[PDB]
């Protein structure tokens, strides 16, 4: 029973790396290996369902917050003119709420030239197994950072060497969360992140 144990080890290895689509072998036997295998299958199913519903909690929070925060937004429109700065302040705070929630959910969510071309629609372009939405979000966050701290230009470029896609700005939580999102996205595709402010991503 050495080989089945080794295969189960392989199963644990695959599950540990995020592969919840992998078949669990040796489920059809009445010995200890069978029991273990069945347990592994149950865990795999649970982990997959949980993986799918990961966003659901924060999305629920946003949903429940959507009604009262909107009523507050409405209340600021029937305020006096003397309290304009107050209404503006409140609105900015609500906007901050939105930014935080959306960014955290974006984190929990975690052809090149095609999607790179898609995100585009001042931006300068020098173009040459994936998750299109993930890459899209990554480029979005990179551009957001480059705009947030780079005063003016933003250069998005491609190329090849063996996949290389890079955003470069002209500049001298929040931002680190976005960078963490980019990092997670590029780590999902077995890639590498490269700073130099220039952000290059390999695939």
Which residues between 148 and 187 bind a copy of itself (CB under 8 A)? 175-181, 183-184, 187
Residue 76 annotated as lining a ligand binding site: no
Cα Rg of the chain, angstroms? 23
Instruction: Tell me how many residues contact a copy of itself (CB under 8 A).
Output: 71
Retrieve residue 80's tokens.
């006096």
Is residue 144 part of the contact set for a copy of itself (CB under 8 A)?
Answer: no
Interacting residue with a copy of itself among 57, 120, 126, 133 (CB under 8 A):
57
Is residue 22 part of the contact set for a copy of itself (CB under 8 A)?
Answer: no
In the Cβ-directed half-sphere of 63, how many Cα atoms lie within 13 Å? 6
In the Cβ-directed half-sphere of 90, how many Cα atoms lie within 13 Å? 15
Interacting residue with a copy of itself among 19, 22, 29, 32 (CB under 8 A):
32
> CA separation (Å) from 201 to 90, 93, 102?
38, 34, 23
Interacting residue with a copy of itself among 6, 120, 126, 133 (CB under 8 A):
6
* Inter-residue contact 162 to 191 (CB < 8 Å): no
Closest distance of CB 148 from a copy of itself, Å: 11
Give 69 or 163: the residue with its C-beta nearer to a copy of itself: 69
Interacting residue with a copy of itself among 30, 78, 121, 195 (CB under 8 A):
78
Give 84 or 132: the residue with its C-beta nearer to a copy of itself: 84
> CA separation (Å) from 169 to 7, 18, 95, 156?
49, 34, 26, 9
Give 35 or 120: the residue with its C-beta nearer to a copy of itself: 35
Retrieve residue 39's tokens.
């347990």
Residue 26 annotated as lining a ligand binding site: yes
Interacting residue with a copy of itself among 20, 59, 119, 123 (CB under 8 A):
59
SS3 146: helix
Residue 177 annotated as lining a ligand binding site: yes
> CA separation (Å) from 176 to 20, 97, 159, 195?
29, 17, 26, 14
Q: Which residues are annotated as a binding site for Zn(2+)?
A: 7, 26
Binding residues for ATP: 63, 145-149, 169, 175-179
Binding site, annotated residues: 7, 26, 63, 145-149, 169, 175-179
């Amino acid at each position: 029973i050495t080989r089945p144990i080794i295969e189960l080890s392989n199963t644990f290895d695959k599950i540990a790396e995020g592969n919840l689509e992998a078949e669990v072998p040796h489920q059809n036997r009445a010995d200890e290996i069978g029991i273990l295998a069945k347990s592994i299958e149950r865990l795999r199913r649970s982990l997959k369902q949980l993986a799918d519903d990961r966003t659901l909690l924060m999305a629920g929070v946003s949903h429940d917050l959507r009604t009262p925060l909107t009523r507050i937004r409405l209340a600021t429109e029937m305020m006096s003119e003397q309290d304009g700065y107050l209404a503006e302040s409140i609105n900015k705070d609500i906007e901050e709420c939105n930014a935080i929630i959306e960014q955290f959910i974006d984190y929990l969510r975690t052809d090149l030239n095609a999607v790179l071309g898609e995100v585009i629609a001042e931006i300068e372009t020098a173009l040459y197994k994936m998750h299109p939405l993930s890459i899209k979000r990554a480029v979005a966050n990179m551009v957001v950072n480059a705009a947030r701290y780079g005063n003016g230009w933003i250069k998005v470029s491609s190329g090849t060497e063996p996949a290389w896609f890079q955003v470069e700005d002209d500049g001298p939580s929040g931002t680190g969360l976005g960078l963490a999102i980019v990092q997670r996205i590029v780590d999902n595709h077995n890639g590498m992140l490269e700073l130099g402010l220039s952000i290059r991503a390999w695939l």
